[model samples]
Target chain A: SAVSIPIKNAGFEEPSLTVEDYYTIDTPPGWITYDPNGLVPAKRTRITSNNGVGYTGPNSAYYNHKAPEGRNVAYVYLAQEIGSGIAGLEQTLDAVLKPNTKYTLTVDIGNSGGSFQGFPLDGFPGYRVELLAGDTVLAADQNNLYIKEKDFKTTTVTFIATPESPYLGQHLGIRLINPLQGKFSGVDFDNVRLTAEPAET
Target chain B: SAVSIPIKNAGFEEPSLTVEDYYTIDTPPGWITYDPNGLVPAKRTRITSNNGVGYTGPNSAYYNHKAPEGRNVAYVYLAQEIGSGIAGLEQTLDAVLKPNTKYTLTVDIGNSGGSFQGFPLDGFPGYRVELLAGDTVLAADQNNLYIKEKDFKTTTVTFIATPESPYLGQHLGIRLINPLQGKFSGVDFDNVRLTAEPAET
Candidate 1:
């Protein structure tokens, strides 16, 4: 039997949540905040993911502030106008699971470039999602996954954490980085879920 | 009787006319050029008038270079992307226009922003077209012209030269100066027709 885990907004508003709220590190449920210093545009919105639903700019300021650092090892969601040489958001999350434990991660992403001038569905680039355990790179490729607008399919990564892995439960981070420069516009993201496997016989 | 002027491309392609073909100069028309320091980003399509039709952007460099030193003047259409700023394309017509001539100048124009943003009926900001005759000053007020998509209208101004006017007929020049800096996105101008009249008239 497959178990479903639902991600909620805590006390925040339902349906559409902002980037600022997602970046708040002090929020409950042991979710620590990571600051990427990517301030929201003076007059635009930020990217966000909530409850398997994603949204990009023009996002509310309440959510735009929570971007990861642009440098190495930070998670960010960028809200920007389409142009050349622009960077998107990224983040890394720590994971702790026992050996043979089946874990599933679901990301709900939203991109505004679908309607923007330069962003074509098939032409839009892809992203890389990985689960790294020290020297052991658990899964790469599409299984790790890089999804775009044309794919129009929600992405999921299933990983069986290796118990003897060197970096198990040790400062593991999930990084969502865009390598393309200034090609994509108004990209948004929201709703990230991580569920561990139930005890089996 | 109101005259309707259909804007004609002075150069090769209808959409790709060069500056040399747009206007006649006192000297034989040569390659039209602009101040590299004053060049700005402009589209070729936004030029128009209240009673006329045409494209916009800087007029080809024909008008300014051919006039006598004190009479340099040229009419070039501007587009909506160029808001009120002193930094757009600027050209110098050899001075040919006299200081005290009441020159009646007319142009076809339209509000490009209102049209591009799906508000065809909305009017663009008005213009106060000014002419410099030697050391004298003359100006006319042509306000609130509406330009729909693929349609044009005309605006006219008459400037009487005065002793205070900069009489550059030996070195004539015309400036597309914007007075209301904040309210306008930009303006389109075309078919700059000028006729010299008696100073008082």
Candidate 2:
């Protein structure tokens, strides 16, 4: 049977915020940022409403930039030096799962077209979305290949519920991570979606 | 987070069965029976190692007998004078579950104190085992209460997968069902157990 649970704020529509320029740290409502060292640097993540510059939405999440020097830096003052750290965004799932069921999560992953400020285009910095039941990852997909500059591609990950799944009855979650690599290689994300249904008998 | 998985064939030791009496319908390896139609009777569920008239094992799993009848009636030719139908048995869950996760399933519900063959029990007729995932009930307990001749009691059901849910990689299953309303009721179960671990943080 086809069963679907709508993800709240699935497209970064709530807690609306706009990015006039690049590099400003503005955590969208309902989402949290993760930075391991608690160190200060250019804001590595932010919500942007800008059109044509990089995203299509009234808002989208942007990540990666050099410290204080990049024009498109989401947070100029909070920028970390190249290769200094890793960071990203996360949100807990509002829906629980059915045992032995299958689910799919899809999101738009985009690569910033040009080298912003001084950072070089080494490649599309790897980006990944993880389906988590608590802290354990039920499914994940990471991409490190080259994505055309200024272009976006949809990515998907699928997983099945186990009989002893701890996430059963409990909320599930999503984590997007930008492994620390190219500091100026930015990425754009939007239209996050999740759908579920009974497994085929 | 520490997670744990359970051992297989929980009770009913290796190579699990034997049909030493008259025309037999042995409870298959790995589990017992559940009949929906309350037709004829001589408990179709029983266990005997030949130790006593009840149980001790080299064998166990005994059922259906009218004290005056011969040694075995796992499949008695004598039908229930009131209702007409056969009973059954089932067993699943060959695999384990995830660690650091929560789960719940319990067993050991019994009846079989004496014989009421022709008389009708006023309440329910059978029982069931359910399998679940999150809030979704994959399978459910299907027992009708008030078994006339046998002494009965309810049991426990709860298990959890640890944070590391290793069993998350396998499928979970459900076994056995007691159909509704049978006066000369017959039921036997044992070693009921279920285990779990912590939920993800």
Highest-scoring model, TM-score? 2
Q: Output the number of the DockQ-best candidate.
A: 2
Q: What lDDT score belongs to each candidate, Candidate 1 first? A: 0.34, 0.44
Please write out the lDDT profile of model 2 over residues B1-201, one tens digit for every residue: 433335344333333223443223455345544444534234443332100122323222222332221221122121243234434444455554565455555654554443245543322334444443331223233331222233434544343433322235456654433332233334444443555546542
Q: What is the TM-score of each candidate against the true structure?
A: 0.29, 0.40
TM-score of chain A for candidate 2? 0.70
State the lDDT of candidate 1 residue by residue for B1-201, as single tens digits: 222222223121223323344322111122132323333333233332111112233321112122111122223333333232222112244436554455555655433433435534232233434343333223323232323322345655544443322332543333343322222334444445556554531
| Model 2 RMSD, rounded to 1 decimal | 18.3
Give TM-scores of the second chain, every candidate.
Answer: 0.44, 0.30
lDDT of 2 by residue, A95-160 (tens): 876676777777776665444355543334345567766655555554412234455567666666
What's model 2's lDDT at A133? 65
**Residue A147 deviation, candidate 1, in Å?**
5.7
Model 1, A29-145: lDDT tens digits are 323232234333333333431112232223323232222211111123333332222233333443443554565655543322334345342223233343434423343212112
